[PDB]
Amino acid sequence: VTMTLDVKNDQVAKHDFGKPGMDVGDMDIFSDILSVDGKQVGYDGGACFFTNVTPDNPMTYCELTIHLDAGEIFARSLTPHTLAPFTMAITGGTGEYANSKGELTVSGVATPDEKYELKLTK
Amino acid sequence: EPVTMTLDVKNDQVAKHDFGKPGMDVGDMDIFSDILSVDGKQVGYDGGACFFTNVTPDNPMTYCELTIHLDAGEIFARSLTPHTLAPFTMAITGGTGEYANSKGELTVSGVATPDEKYELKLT
Amino acid sequence: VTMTLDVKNDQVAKHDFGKPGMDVGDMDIFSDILSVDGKQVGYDGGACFFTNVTPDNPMTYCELTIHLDAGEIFARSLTPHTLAPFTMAITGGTGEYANSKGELTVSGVATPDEKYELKLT
Numbered sequence: 001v002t003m004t005l006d007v008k009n010d011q012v013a014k015h016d017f018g019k020p021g022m023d024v025g026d027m028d029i030f031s032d033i034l035s036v037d038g039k040q041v042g043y044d045g046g047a048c049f050f051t052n053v054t055p056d057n058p059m060t061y062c063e064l065t066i067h068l069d070a071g072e073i074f075a076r077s078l079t080p081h082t083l084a085p086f087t088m089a090i091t092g093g094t095g096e097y098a099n100s101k102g103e104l105t106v107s108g109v110a111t112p113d114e115k116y117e118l119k120l121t122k
Numbered sequence: 123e124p125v126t127m128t129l130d131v132k133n134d135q136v137a138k139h140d141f142g143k144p145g146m147d148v149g150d151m152d153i154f155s156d157i158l159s160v161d162g163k164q165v166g167y168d169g170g171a172c173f174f175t176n177v178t179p180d181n182p183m184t185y186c187e188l189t190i191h192l193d194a195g196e197i198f199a200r201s202l203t204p205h206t207l208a209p210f211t212m213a214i215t216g217g218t219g220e221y222a223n224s225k226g227e228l229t230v231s232g233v234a235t236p237d238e239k240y241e242l243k244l245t
Numbered sequence: 246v247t248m249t250l251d252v253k254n255d256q257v258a259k260h261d262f263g264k265p266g267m268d269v270g271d272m273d274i275f276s277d278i279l280s281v282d283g284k285q286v287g288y289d290g291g292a293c294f295f296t297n298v299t300p301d302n303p304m305t306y307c308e309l310t311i312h313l314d315a316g317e318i319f320a321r322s323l324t325p326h327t328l329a330p331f332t333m334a335i336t337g338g339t340g341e342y343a344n345s346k347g348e349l350t351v352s353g354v355a356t357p358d359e360k361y362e363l364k365l366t
């Protein structure tokens with residue numbers, strides 16, 4: 001099962017803790033509307049914790065839940081948090097996606113042009 | 123054969139982080155622990171965190187993670203659901219000990235009442 | 246299969262919210278460099294949430310992701326968060342560690358002698 005999801009950010013909190021500006025311990029909490037071919041197919045919610053920030057690369061531990069009609073999909077990542085694609089591990093899901101594994105690649109994170117490419121093994 | 127369990131839940135310690143804009147909005151967070159009992163005897167405890175991913179006046183959505191500790195092992199659950207007084211169902215994603223390789227669901231009823239319960243179906 | 250990783254704290258944020266000092270709702274966010282025999286073999290990142298604090302025991306829900314070349318390892322714990330050794334559950338991984346389970350014991354946490362001892366099944 002594959003899916004190309006267009007991601008429209010719904011709400012986002014970019015929490016600046018600690019030292020002003022992006023640094024270890026900051027965190028983003030967010031929700032998105034998911035679409036395919038211009039039709040909404042579901043939504044998601046997630047949190048990213050900035051575990052390591054250098055000027056070239058802010059590293060995040062991210063947790064994401066996707067809600068689709070057939071069920072939910074759970075993913076997690078420890079990756080650079082940039083526009084370059086990064087791949088989250090799909091650890092499971094519910095409904096049609098129970099006991100699923102696979103990968104979710106995030107492109108253009110935290111921009112209007114964000115997309116997910118899902119590859120599920122089930 | 124699926125196993126069910128009915129746990130009575132008493133909130134132990136709780137922090138409601140009102141981050142971001144004061145008042146309920148995206149990015150707020152609850153961190154909590156509970157005492158678990160059955161038939162009037164403590165059987166374990168839990169700890170968890172909820173993140174408000176989307177807040178509108180009609181529906182505050184939370185991503186929640188929960189760990190239950192029993193003598194027989196741990197149980198892990200997660201949800202992305204409205205964070206209201208209505209019952210909501212979490213996915214059991216795994217566990218330890220007796221609950222190693224567990225899957226299933228956990229329904230939370232009466233949240234933030236004295237009669238809060240978890241109803242588990244483990245497969 | 247066992248594995249012992251030496252752990253060097255890289256960046257750490259200790260968020261003291263609410264009442265000063267450890268109490269429910271505080272959180273630590275961290276990254277580490279992982280090494281074996283003095284050579285870096287990967288890195289990790291994690292977050293701990295203080296779920297219950299009494300004078301005797303600061304309980305944390307911790308999530309950890311270890312990144313090695315062969316794959317990632319996911320662990321989580323609900324345990325006391327002291328200098329004493331504590332054991333995390335390995336819930337999964339990627340690559341070589343896909344479908345991994347087991348336990349990860351953290352000793353010497355946040356000291357120069359921190360180590361992870363993994364038992365993967």
Ligand SMILES: Oc1cccc2nc3ccccc3nc12
Nearest residue numbers: 012028030048062064106109110
């Ligand atoms: O930090 C962020 C801000 C706003 C939206 C985001 N969406 C994500 C989706 C998958 C993984 C990480 C993400 N991080 C995000």
Ligand SMILES: Oc1cccc2nc3ccccc3nc12
Nearest residue numbers: 133136152154170172186188230
């Ligand atoms: O936000 C919360 C505050 C206090 C206690 C809570 N207990 C929960 C148990 C299962 C799932 C979500 C929960 N959220 C909670």
Ligand SMILES: Oc1cccc2nc3ccccc3nc12
Nearest residue numbers: 257273275293307309351354355
């Ligand atoms: O609170 C902390 C501060 C600095 C480093 C830490 N490393 C950990 C590794 C596994 C579990 C919990 C941890 N907590 C940590």
Ligand SMILES: [Ca+2]
Nearest residue numbers: 017019021023
């Ligand atoms: Ca900051």
Ligand SMILES: [Ca+2]
Nearest residue numbers: 141143145147
């Ligand atoms: Ca707020």
Ligand SMILES: [Ca+2]
Nearest residue numbers: 262264266268
């Ligand atoms: Ca505090």
